[PDB]
Design a protein around this nucleic acid. Structure first.
Ligand SMILES: [Mg+2]
Ligand SMILES: [Mg+2]
Ligand SMILES: [Mg+2]
Ligand SMILES: [Mg+2]
Ligand SMILES: [Mg+2]
Ligand SMILES: [Mg+2]
Ligand SMILES: [Mg+2]
Ligand SMILES: [Mg+2]
Ligand SMILES: [Mg+2]
Ligand SMILES: [Mg+2]
Ligand SMILES: [Mg+2]
Ligand SMILES: [Zn+2]
Lengths: 67, 177, 136, 50, 116
RNA sequence: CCGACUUACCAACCCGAUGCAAACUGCGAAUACCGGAGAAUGUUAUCACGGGAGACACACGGCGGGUGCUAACGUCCGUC
RNA sequence: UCCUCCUAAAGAGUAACGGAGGAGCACGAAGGUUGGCUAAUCCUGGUCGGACAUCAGGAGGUUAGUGCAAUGGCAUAAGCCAGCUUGACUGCGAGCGUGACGGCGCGAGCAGGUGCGAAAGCAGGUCAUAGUGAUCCGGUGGUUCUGAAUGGAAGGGCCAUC
RNA sequence: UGCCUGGCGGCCGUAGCGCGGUGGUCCCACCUGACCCCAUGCCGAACUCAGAAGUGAAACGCCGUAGCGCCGAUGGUAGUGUGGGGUCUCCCCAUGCGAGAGUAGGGAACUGCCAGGCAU
């Protein structure tokens, strides 16, 4: 790798909303908290879809509170 | 090489058992990933191509190749030698890092997801695909990029046919139907 | 009117009609018209013979034209003097050597094919003869 | 005949010169070349002139 | 492929040396071994040779395929040529760049006495 | 959401069988030309230099062609 | 006027108001050298993208390319890319080709001073063949020449140029 | 001396393609890693360096096999120099030269120097 011309390229970390954190090297520049990963996806043996993962769905139904 | 090591401990033997390959290196391995992105509008604005080049250097940590027209085509108003595309080739540890990043984070982030097609193997086992939108990569800062710009991802493999090509991709839990 | 659709050049030297022919065998049909003499067949001559020959057999069988007009012939206009460049292309001709098969015919009885070639050869300047296919 | 004859004069001050042609609509800057000077029998800088 | 590209690289120097009628020191390089031959101007007969596939050279060489291996073989090939009576040759890198062992072999030959 | 067929339509590339070419050639003569050697024959028939020229409107016939109409005691070249 | 092909009859040359096309330039890199590289076209797959843009593989093997016509040539490329650079050098020049001549062209090698290359080496312009104009008359710079009584000078000569 | 392998040639398709099989002691190739010497219009793909875990898969070498490529007679034909003829746009005769295509066939190269490994 040519060094002066090339961008800085070091180790980072990326955590998922499910609490699964992945150790990987990229060039985002700083750590990030991502919402969906490979494991928490309906197509990758996703028996537990992201419905159980909360968010603005919770705010609405806890706002409304009507079963 | 956090998936290169993953490859050599189970996948090599996994293809060995179910295909009866005589030697272990007969199990294919992905040699390179080519990151292509042809702008096609540099004729309208040269300056959108450098920004596009910067975008691809963010998604994958490499300076992209500026391709030339290579031939004059009047149907698109291009003359040979004109910058028309962007290209990167990744091999080894950088290749594996991009591969795992794609599959684990980005591929789930595809809008209107239904998985990936298993018929685009050109008959020789080498996969090629196109992503519809570019924000899916977390390397690029959302709201700081001018426009959405997709690209093509082609997986060039030593595999001589699509059947063993599908074995290699599936053993990586690649998203097939 | 047989004529090349396009040509590399529009005029050609006069040349010479020497030697014997190539394609002296009935290769496609069962019967054939074979040129005994040598000379030039104009596209009009070839086409007039074809009309009589195809009409003789009541549009039966199959008809093959074995010759093509590919040599352009120029003619100077009436009452122009010599020189001032070469003349303008008026018509096309094929060069014919002795033994060349000009027309072939199939799908019809031999007695009818013989009669059809008689009417067709009445339109040609060169002596002809009736031939049939042979196993070599 | 856009290209016009120009004279390249040696910087050694011996008055020797070469002749050539240059396109002046493009590349309007001066031409400089280390060329042989037959008088001092050396290679010296030649500068644009005429 | 690989060998075909290397032959195409070497061809111009090989043919130019044949035209000049110069004794040509051909160097071959493989990942495990490096080879050198002094070739007569007619091109069919060899005069001296030295290689790291050799009983005499291998015991001294810790690991064949090194620059020190190139130095050893260069000195060896140069002394053999010198004691036969050959003093002026022309280098033939055989399509390799003059950077590593080819340069190392040539550098080794210079001190021992060849003229190139 | 990517599909799988079908019919008497058009059908490029390709294959097999056919021809043609001054400005086509993966083939290829006879002659001609250049050079080396040998005999015989030939009043040096060869070359070089110098004195003197004339001539530079050609014609037909054979052979190889262009042009014309494979017209011309036509016209324009090559060669005898 | 000049270049390419055919006529042109397998050495050269060969005419017509014969058949077809071009030139009156361009480039300080598009030259020198070192290193590196190899197309057209088609099929398959691939975001906009389609017959045809960029990408991957395959077939194929020059069917491409050459600054500009045509012919011959070109892979050891003469085609493509990059580094360095000015040999697009000066005085000669064995020998040879081609012209009635004027003239035109090729050229190893020698001397001086250079560039590239580790070196062997290569380089006296460009893949070659068009891109051109005698002499007279003047203009410009230089010059170890000449200078109409002598010393200068004008003018002339020589060399380089317009 | 026999086999296997590498390099440099001769030669320039009878030698090149295709199909099938076969080789890892040595060799060859793939191969391992790369701050580094060195390099990529990016990329250790190529080039380079540090090495020898694995493998003969590709490639490469070798063996076999005519689906091609290729070579290829004899005879005949075309043409043609010289001389002579005719019914002279073209032929014929005497004599000399004599193709191209095609056919019967051939054909899976042969060979030189050196270096290594195995065997004797
Ligand atoms: Mg006169
Ligand atoms: Mg006259
Ligand atoms: Mg005359
Ligand atoms: Mg007359
Ligand atoms: Mg001639
Ligand atoms: Mg002749
Ligand atoms: Mg050029
Ligand atoms: Mg005076
Ligand atoms: Mg014969
Ligand atoms: Mg024959
Ligand atoms: Mg034959
Ligand atoms: Zn998750």
């Amino acid at each position: 790798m040519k060094k002066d011309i090339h961008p800085k390229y070091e180790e980072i970390t990326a955590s998922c909303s499910c609490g699964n954190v992945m150790k990987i090297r990229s060039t985002v520049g700083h750590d990030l908290n991502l919402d969906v990963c490979s494991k928490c996806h309906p197509f990758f043996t996703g028996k537990q879809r992201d419905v159980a993962t909360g968010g603005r769905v919770d705010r609405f139904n806890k706002r409304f509170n009507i079963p | 090489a956090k998936l290169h090591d993953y490859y050599k401990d189970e996948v090599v033997k996994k293809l060995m058992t179910e295909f009866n390959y005589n030697s272990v290196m007969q199990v294919p391995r992905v040699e390179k990933i080519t990151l292509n992105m042809g702008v096609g509008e540099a004729i309208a604005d040269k300056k959108l191509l450098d920004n596009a080049a910067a975008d691809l250097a963010a998604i994958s940590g490499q300076k992209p190749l500026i391709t030339k027209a290579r031939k004059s085509v009047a149907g698109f108003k291009i003359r040979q030698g004109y910058p028309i595309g962007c290209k990167v080739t990744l091999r080894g540890e950088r290749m594996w890092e991009f591969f795992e990043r794609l599959i684990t984070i980005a591929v789930p982030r595809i809008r209107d997801f239904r998985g990936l097609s298993a018929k685009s193997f050109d008959g020789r086992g080498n996969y090629s695909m196109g992503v519809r939108e570019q924000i899916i990569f977390p390397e690029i800062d959302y709201d700081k990029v001018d426009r959405v710009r997709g690209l093509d991802i082609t997986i060039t493999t030593t595999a001589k046919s699509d059947e063993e090509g599908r074995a290699l991709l599936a053993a990586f839990d690649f998203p097939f139907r | 009117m047989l004529q090349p659709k396009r040509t590399k050049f529009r005029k050609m030297h006069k040349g010479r009609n020497r030697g014997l022919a190539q394609g002296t065998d009935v290769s496609f049909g069962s019967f054939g018209l074979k040129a005994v003499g040598r000379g030039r067949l104009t596209a009009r001559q070839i086409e007039a013979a074809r009309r009589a020959m195809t009409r003789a057999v009541k549009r039966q069988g199959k008809i093959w034209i074995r010759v093509f007009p590919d040599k352009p012939i120029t003619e100077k206009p009436l009452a122009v003097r010599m020189g001032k460049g070469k003349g303008n292309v008026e018509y096309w001709v094929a060069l014919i050597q002795p033994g060349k098969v000009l027309y072939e015919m199939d799908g019809v009885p031999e007695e009818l094919a013989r009669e059809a070639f008689k009417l067709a050869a009445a339109k040609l300047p060169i002596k002809t003869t009736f031939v049939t296919k042979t196993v070599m | 005949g856009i290209r016009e004859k120009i004279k390249l004069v040696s910087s050694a001050g011996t008055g020797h010169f070469y002749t050539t042609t240059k396109n002046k609509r493009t590349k309007p800057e001066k031409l400089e070349l280390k060329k042989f000077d037959p008088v001092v029998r050396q290679h010296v800088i030649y500068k644009e002139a005429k | 492929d690989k060998k075909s590209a290397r032959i195409r690289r070497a061809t111009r120097a090989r043919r130019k040396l044949q035209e000049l009628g110069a004794t040509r020191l051909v160097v071959h390089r493989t990942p495990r071994h490096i080879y050198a031959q002094v070739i007569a101007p007619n091109g069919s007969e060899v005069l001296v040779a030295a290689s790291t596939v050799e009983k005499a050279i291998a015991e001294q060489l810790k690991y064949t395929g090194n620059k020190d291996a190139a130095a050893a073989v260069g000195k060896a090939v140069a002394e053999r040529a010198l004691e036969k009576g050959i003093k002026d040759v022309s280098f033939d890198r055989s399509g390799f760049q003059y950077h590593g062992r080819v340069q190392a072999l040539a550098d080794a030959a210079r001190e021992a006495g060849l003229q190139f």
